[PDB]
């Protein structure tokens, strides 16, 4: 399925080249511009654990998730991954725990040392 495919066929987008964040572009976005550090970014996403369970979805809440890029307001894999996306793009990210919630995990559903899969859509980005 999709998590196996990004694990085996994804692009390492880390600056360390440590396979910690793998990406596949699923829907090509618009133009060539990617967001800037500090921009307000608006995303839709769904997250799955390596056991197949869905742990989160913004679609199910009928509102996007909004954060300031490159500020550590989200897991490192998202600050790195969303910074590579074009407006309108949909991608898959496969995130090792060192770029996600590490040994602590995140209650109630993310265990310690969890590799996470996300589908992310970059809806928009704007500077303040
Ligand atoms: Na595929
Ligand atoms: Na891109």
Swiss-Prot record:
Posttranslational modification: Acetylation impairs ability to promote interaction between Akt/AKT1 and PHLPP1. Deacetylation by SIRT7 promotes interaction between Akt/AKT1 and PHLPP1, leading to suppress Akt/AKT1 activation.
In-chain residues carrying the UniProt-annotated modification N6-acetyllysine: 16
Compartment annotation: Cytoplasm; Nucleus
Transmembrane segments: none
Expression across tissues: Widely expressed, enriched in testis compared to other tissues.
The protein's assembly and partners: Part of a heteromultimeric cytoplasmic complex with HSP90AA1, HSPA1A/HSPA1B and steroid receptors. Upon ligand binding dissociates from the complex and FKBP4 takes its place. Interacts with functionally mature heterooligomeric progesterone receptor complexes along with HSP90 and TEBP. Interacts with NR3C1. Interacts with Akt/AKT1 and PHLPP1; enhancing dephosphorylation and subsequent activation of Akt/AKT1. Interacts with IFI44L; this interaction modulates the kinase activity of IKBKB and IKBKE. Interacts with IKBKB and IKBKE.
Name used for this protein in its record: Peptidyl-prolyl cis-trans isomerase FKBP5
Organism from which the protein derives: Homo sapiens
Lineage: Eukaryota, Metazoa, Chordata, Craniata, Vertebrata
Included range, full protein: 16 to 140 of 457
